[PDB]
Amino acid sequence: EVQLVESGGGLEQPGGSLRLSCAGSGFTFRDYAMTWVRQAPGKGLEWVSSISGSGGNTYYADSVKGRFTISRDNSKNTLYLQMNSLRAEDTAVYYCAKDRLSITIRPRYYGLDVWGQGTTVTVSSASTKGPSVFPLAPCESTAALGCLVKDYFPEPVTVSWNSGALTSGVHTFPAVLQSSGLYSLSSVVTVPSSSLGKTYTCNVDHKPSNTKVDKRVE
Amino acid sequence: DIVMTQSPLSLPVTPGEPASISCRSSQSLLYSIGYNYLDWYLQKSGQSPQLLIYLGSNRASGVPDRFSGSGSGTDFTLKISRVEAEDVGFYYCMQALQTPYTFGQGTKLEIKRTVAAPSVFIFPPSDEQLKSGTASVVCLLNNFYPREAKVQWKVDNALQSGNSQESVTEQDSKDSTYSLSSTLTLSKADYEKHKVYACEVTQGTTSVTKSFNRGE
């Protein structure tokens, strides 16, 4: 399968720097132009940069010129975005995308056919804060359980259940921004009450604080 | 830069019925005969964008027959012949004729299903949280339709406002329902001064209140 895996996102100060990576597998990396697209919180899609198969030609959005550099290491099957002089406006999920087939003189376009999973860049003067994870348990035949992921910065937090083994009936809600400027999120699952006396663990990942919390909900 | 404009911006559709999304460009996207540099993408909630249509009319890998693209020059249309529940999300057109690549604003495809009552659950604050001096009380509204429902928090039968926040999931890809989570936030001192905590959920002719007693 043709796949793109991203890394390198995080929280940085204005004027700071960050490098994003996009690793390809299941295809010949050098045969394809590659593209970065971003999505600001609650907004649409915006093109950032494109690079030719060889790396000989580079293209940039006007707002990132002189700040961002697109590059690739074809021997490592990896696309890069060096992000210098970071601005608050750069806060977004960044996606890499497979672009035109480039083994003929004129490249052949087949759409942006494969996309990475995204990596998040947040540009703020505020410090990182890891989450406090608390159980949601009742005080019927179907019971709800969950985790409250409280007082973190910045977005995002990912939540899984039983290391990804439990997916049906999982609802992980959008975070709310509290008056404190910190986020709070809940994740819930519905389970049979008869087998409560089965273990249910939420797995909470917060990349910006380098923190993973597993919480067993009793 | 080439500007892409989509119409409509919100599209509510009954399952089985057709859907049509228009995309207009400020400049012609016809590079040569058969080469309109116009794509369509779907972004499902919490997912990366995925290719549907490229070069005006070509279905991408794995894309169901129900999706088709047509048009030329400046006027383009995505058609879904019969809308299914899993089609829910945001649809974007994109031009790839020139850099910068530019996208339409996005069209939110909504699924018009039957009314479903929420399953309501209430959660007390954990003992662990109470040690920090704050109490979060949580109310869950599970798998309901339509989106419009009201949560009213009550503490010893007194109506609460300005001390809760809520959020709602996007439409479920399988059953087309929404879910809602509301958090009531109190100091430990305020929490321990009261007994009955109640979340009242109002949807049309029905109000459902789930409650707990702090002492129990």
Author numbering:
A (entry chain A): 1 to 139, 145 to 202, 204 to 224
B (entry chain B): 1 to 216
Give the authors' words.
By engineering a small secondary structural element from the rabbit light chain constant domain into the human kappa light chain, we dramatically improved the crystallization of human Fabs and Fab:antigen complexes. Alignment of a human Fab structure onto a rabbit Fab showed that the longer FG loop present in human Kappa constant domains forms a bent and bulging conformation that would interfere with a beta sheet packing interaction. In the case of the FG loop, this consisted in replacing the septamer human sequence HQGLSSP (positions 198 to 204 according to Kabat numbering) between the structurally homologous T and V (position 197 and 205 respectively, according to Kabat numbering), with the pentamer rabbit sequence QGTTS (positions 199 to 203 according to Kabat numbering). The resulting mutant is shorter by two residues, with deletions of histidine at position 198 and proline at position 205, and is referred to here as ΔQGTTSΔ (positions 198 to 204 according to Kabat numbering).
One is derived from the publicly available dupilumab (Dupixent™) sequence. The most dramatic difference was upon incorporating the ΔQGTTSΔ FG loop. Dupilumab parental Fab yielded crystals in 4 conditions but dupilumab Fab that contained ΔQGTTSΔ yielded crystals in approximately 120 conditions. The highest resolution structure for the dupilumab Fab incorporated only the FG loop mutation ΔQGTTSΔ. All structures derived from Fabs with the ΔQGTTSΔ FG loop on the other hand packed forming a beta sheet between the G strand of the kappa constant domain and the G strand of the constant heavy 1 (CH1) domain. This interaction is similar but not identical to that was seen in rabbit Fab crystal packing. Besides the FG loops the only substantial difference between the parental dupilumab Fab structure and the structures of the engineered variants is that in the parental structure the heavy chain CDR3 and light chain CDR1 loops are disordered.
